[PDB]
Symmetry: D2
C-alpha cells in the first residue's frame, strides 16, 4: 500500500505542513479560525478561508485501477452571536493538488455556480448553515455530499448546537465505494449520519490535497465562526 | 497505556481465542452463526448464542481512576424468511470476566428480567428486532444502549434491511464519556446513529470480556439469523487513534 | 488479516490476561519478576518462572499455507549481586497453547534435555547468561535462536550491563522467513543484533501462546533477577 | 500529539509527495534511483541525488520543550560492477525544511567540508562505502551517525552484500534520546546495529524535512547504484507503537 497520515491534536501559529488560503489562520491558542473572527470572538461577514495539508495524497491509481480507502476525524465549533441569522458553513474536501479558493458565501469556496461541472474535480462533505434555494438546499441546516456540484447529491438534517464542539468522522470504503459522514455533539448527546456511494475514480484526479473550506454570509449579521480544534487523516491505496 | 486489540477478518472452525457459549458456532465458510441455522440457511427458534474474546480487557483502573477508550467494528447479517415475524436480536457487550448466558428471547442472553440491577455489571449495544412492551421497547426495530438493564437507557430507530450486511462502529471516549454506535447498509445506503453519556467506571468491573450475544424468538415462526462476518476491537487504558483504526482494519 | 496485539506498559498485581507459571509474580510497583527475588531485591537460586499472554495467537494457516508476521518489544533488567557467578537467563518464546514449564537451570523452562525434538514445537530467542558446554553454549553471554532445541541454531555475543534496563525488538517477516532480534542499553549505548531464516510453519502449531520464561542457577550464589518492565506484541496473519 | 507518517511500498514516476533533487529519479519499475544508472544497470560516476518527503515534520517544540520520537524503515540495494572500487554511499537524514544538496562525493550531499558546524542543522545515518581519511572514516565500509559534520560521532562496521537488498530500521526515542540504526540482509542473514545518544533539540530546527541522499565517486571506476525500493516513516511529538510500526506502519 501507498499510505499517508497525520494528526494535528492542535494547530500552531507556525504550521508549515498546512497551506492556509484566504482568511484562515491559526490563533495563539491553537485553533484554526477558517473565517474571520475579531478580538472579542465576533465572526465577520464576507469571509472565505481554506486550510489544506501540504502533501498530495495518492487517491487512486491508473495502472492498477485501485482507489484508496480513507478516514478523517476532526473537532469543530460554529458559534453564532444570533442563531436567527447564520451562514454559510464549512466543508471537508478533496480537490486537485493546485486548487485555489472558488466563490465564497454559499459556494463554500469550492464551486463557482449552481451547475454540475466535471472539471472542478472536487468531492466535499458540507456542514451547511444557510438555505440557497438556487442550490436545491433543504429547508434545514444539513450535512451534504457534494460531488462536482454545490447541489448536494444527498443530504440529511443536522441540528447545529450553537458554540458547542462537534466531533466528525468521515470514512470512505474502496471495496463498497461508500462515503459515510457522522457528527456527534458530546455536550448535547445528539448525533447525525449520512451515507452514499461515490465513485472517486471518475471524479477526482489520481493525486489530491485535502483540507477544509468555510464561508460566512454575504449580508451583515449572517455571521458565524468556523473553528477547527483538531484534525486527523489516514489514507490507504493498495497496489 | 494498557492496550488490547484484535481483528477477525473471517472466523475459523477452530478458533481458540474466541469462547463460544450456547448455540454459537463458526461455519466452514467462516461465518459466526450466533444462533441456530439449519443446512438450508433457515434460522431456528428457541435459540441463544454468544461469542467472547478469550482475553480479559482492562477497561478501568482503581489506582488511577482512569477509564479506557475503545472502538469496535463488525459486519453482520440478519436474514428473516418472513419479515413480519422476527425476533429477538443481537448485541455487542462488555460484562464481567466470568459472565455466562442469562435468559434468552427478548433478554438477549444478557439479563434475567425487566428490572435494572447493578450486579449485572453489563453494558450492551443492542440491535433489537422485537417489541417487548414490558421492557419499554419502542414501536420499531431499534438500536439501544443497555446499562445493567434490558430497558435501554436510550434507543433510536434502525430499519433492518432483510438479508443484507450491516457495518457497525461502536466507540467509547473516556474523556467525554460518550458511547456512540452507528450502523450503515452499503447495499441500501441507509445509516443510523445513537450517542449517550455512560459511566463505565460505576457500571463495569475493572476487567471485562467483550463479545456478542443473540437470541431467536421463543415462538415458532419468530426466527431470523444472527451471522457475524468480521469483528475488530481496540482498547486503550492510559496511565485509540480512530481514523487510523477503522482504516487499519 | 487475523491480528492479535497488546501492550503492557507495566504490569499489575491483578493481571488476568497474563498466565503466570512457576515463581513468576508481578510486584506492587508493576514489575514482572519471572524468578524469585526476596524483599531486599536479592535474587534466589533454584527458581523458574514464566508468563504468557492469555489469548492464543494464530501464527500460520493450514488452508492458505500462509504464515504470520510478528513484532514484539520489551524492556527487562537482569541484576546480579556477584557478576562473577550468574545463571541462567531469560527467553521470549512461542509454544503450543497448553504449554507448561519444562526443566529449569540452563533449559530455561523450555526444553527437557540437550537433544532436538520436533515435538517441543517451541521457538525461542534466549538471553543466556551461563555457558552450558553440554548445549554447545558459546564462551560468552549470548542471544540465541532456539528452534525445538536448547542448542541455539545461531547465536551472537551479548555483553550484560549488570542492573541496567535492556530494550529488545524481535521481528519475524513471513515473506522472507527472517527472524531478527536486537537488544540495546540506553545507559551504556551498547547494541547487539542477530538474524536467521526460520520456517515457523514446520516447527510451530497453527495456534500458539507467547511470553517469557526464565531461570536462576542450580548452584548457590549463581543468581540474577529476570525483571520485565513492559512488553508489547502485534501479529498479522494474511489471507 | 502532532504526528506525521507515510508509506511508499514502491515509488512512481509521478510522485508529487516526494521532492527529487540533483540526479534522483524514479524508474517505470518503481525504483528510486538516487544516483545515475544507465540503461544496462551500470552506475555512473560524479553523481549526487536526493529525495525528501514533501511535508515538513514537527520534530521538537520550543513551547513545551518536547522532542518527537520517530521511526523509519527502508529497503535499498547497492550494486557495484567492481566491488574493489566503490564510493561514496547513501544516507537517511533530517535537515531544515528548505535544505538543498551540499558538496558531493564523500560529503554525501549533506555537508560542505570536514569541519563540524551548528549551522548545518543536519542529523544523518550514513551507509558509507569509501574511506575518507580526512573525515576519520574507519578502514572499513560502515554505518555512522553524522551530527552537523561528515566525521561520524559514532560508527560501526557494515559488510556490504553486493547487489542484495538491505532492510534498515532507524529509531529515535525521545525519553532516552537514543538513536538506533539496524541493517539486515535477508539473503545473507547478516545484521549490524549502532546506538548512540543524540540531542535533537539542540541540533535540528523545530521543523525539518526528511529523506535520502547519495553520491557515487569522483573518479571513474568508483561507482555503485543507490536504489531505494520502499520507505515508511512515522513521528510523534507529544504535548509511536513501534512493534505496530514494524508490523504495519
Ligand atoms: Ca447553503
Ligand atoms: Ca426486544
Ligand atoms: Ca546456558
Ligand atoms: Ca566516506
Ligand atoms: Mn447545502
Ligand atoms: Mn430494545
Ligand atoms: Mn545458550
Ligand atoms: Mn563515514
Amino acid at each position: 500500500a501507498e499510505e499517508t497520515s497525520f494528526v494535528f491534536s492542535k494547530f500552531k501559529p507556525l504550521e508549515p505542513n498546512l497551506i492556509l488560503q484566504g482568511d484562515a489562520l491559526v490563533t495563539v491558542a491553537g485553533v484554526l479560525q477558517l473565517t474571520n473572527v475579531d478580538s472579542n470572538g465576533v465572526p465577520e461577514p464576507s469571509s472565505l478561508g481554506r486550510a489544506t495539508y501540504s502533501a498530495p495524497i495518492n487517491i487512486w491509481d491508473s495502472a492498477t485501477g485501485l482507489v484508496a480507502s480513507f478516514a478523517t476525524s476532526f473537532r469543530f465549533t460554529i458559534y453564532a452571536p444570533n442563531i436567527a441569522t447564520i451562514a454559510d458553513g464549512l466543508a471537508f474536501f478533496l480537490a486537485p493538488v493546485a486548487s485555489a479558493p472558488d466563490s465564497g458565501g454559499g459556494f463554500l469556496g469550492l464551486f463557482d455556480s449552481a451547475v454540475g461541472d466535471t472539471t472542478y474535480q472536487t468531492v466535499a462533505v458540507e456542514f451547511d448553515t444557510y438555505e440557497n434555494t438556487v442550490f436545491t438546499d433543504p429547508p434545514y441546516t444539513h450535512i451534504g455530499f457534494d460531488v462536482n456540484s454545490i447541489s448536494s447529491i444527498k443530504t440529511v438534517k443536522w441540528s447545529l448546537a450553537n458554540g458547542e464542539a462537534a466531533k466528525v468522522l468521515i470514512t470512505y470504503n474502496s471495496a463498497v465505494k461508500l462515503l459515510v459522514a457522522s457528527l456527534v455533539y458530546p455536550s448535547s448527546k445528539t448525533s447525525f449520519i449520512l451515507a452514499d456511494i461515490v465513485d472517486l475514480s471518475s471524479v477526482l484526479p489520481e493525486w489530491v490535497r485535502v483540507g477544509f473550506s468555510a464561508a460566512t454570509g454575504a449580508s451583515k449579521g449572517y455571521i458565524e465562526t468556523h473553528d477547527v480544534f483538531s484534525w486527523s487523516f489516514a489514507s490507504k491505496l493498495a497496489g
